[PDB]
């Protein structure tokens, strides 16, 4: 994981530069997973 | 016995497995689905009633 | 419980516990067990005289 604040421009995507991510979480799940989905906060 | 030394040939059990009249296909020692891939020195067939 | 057949060789440490009937022949088995319709789970019946 990594987190960075960018305030320069809003509509452009994937800002140009180099950033290093760091290891945080290991989990021995042992599950045959071929698909995923993400959650959204809904009213 | 009517024991016929079936040898010097490659046995095709898929005919007996796929045609209509033969029903039971129990196998011991080897898997029943590997027979067409398996080679023999002698196939001792004992047709009985 | 053991088996005699599965449809493919497993990758290491997979836990496929499905008991779906193998259609070894051309018979549309669809839950009817028998010859060329092999149910997976079998037993060995361990005896002290074995």
UniProtKB/Swiss-Prot annotation, chain A:
Q: What outcome is documented for mutating residue 32 to Q in this protein?
A: Increased resistance to neutralizing antibodies
Q: What is the effect of changing residue 20 to V?
A: In strain: 20A.EU1
| Residues with attached carbohydrate | 32
- State the source organism's domain of life: Viruses
**Subunit annotation:** Binds to host ACE2. RBD also interacts with the N-linked glycan on 'Asn-90' of ACE2. Cleavage of S generates a polybasic C-terminal sequence on S1 that binds to host Neuropilin-1 (NRP1) and Neuropilin-2 (NRP2) receptors. Interacts with host integrin alpha-5/beta-1 (ITGA5:ITGB1) and with ACE2 in complex with integrin alpha-5/beta-1 (ITGA5:ITGB1). May interact via cytoplasmic c-terminus with M protein. May interact (via N-terminus) with host bilirubin and biliverdin, thereby preventing antibody binding to the SARS-CoV-2 spike NTD via an allosteric mechanism.
Described function = Attaches the virion to the cell membrane by interacting with host receptor, initiating the infection. The major receptor is host ACE2. When S2/S2' has been cleaved, binding to the receptor triggers direct fusion at the cell membrane. When S2/S2' has not been cleaved, binding to the receptor results in internalization of the virus by endocytosis using host TFRC and GRM2 and leading to fusion of the virion membrane with the host endosomal membrane. Alternatively, may use NRP1/NRP2 and integrin as entry receptors.
- Protein name from the UniProt record: Spike protein S1
């Amino acid at each position: 994981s990594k987190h960075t604040p960018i305030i320069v421009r809003e509509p452009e995507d994937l800002p140009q530069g180099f950033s290093a991510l760091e290891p945080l979480v290991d989990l021995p799940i042992g599950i045959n997973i071929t698909r995923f989905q993400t959650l959204l906060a809904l009213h | 016995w009517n024991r016929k030394r079936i040898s010097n040939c490659v046995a095709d059990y898929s005919v007996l497995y796929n045609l209509a009249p033969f029903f039971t296909f129990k196998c011991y020692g080897v898997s029943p689905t590997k027979l067409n891939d398996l080679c023999f020195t002698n196939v001792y067939a004992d047709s009985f009633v | 419980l053991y088996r005699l057949f599965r449809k493919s060789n497993l990758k290491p440490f997979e836990r496929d516990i499905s008991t779906e009937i193998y259609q070894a022949g051309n018979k549309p088995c669809n839950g009817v067990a028998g010859f060329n319709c092999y149910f997976p789970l079998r037993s060995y019946s361990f005896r002290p005289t074995y």
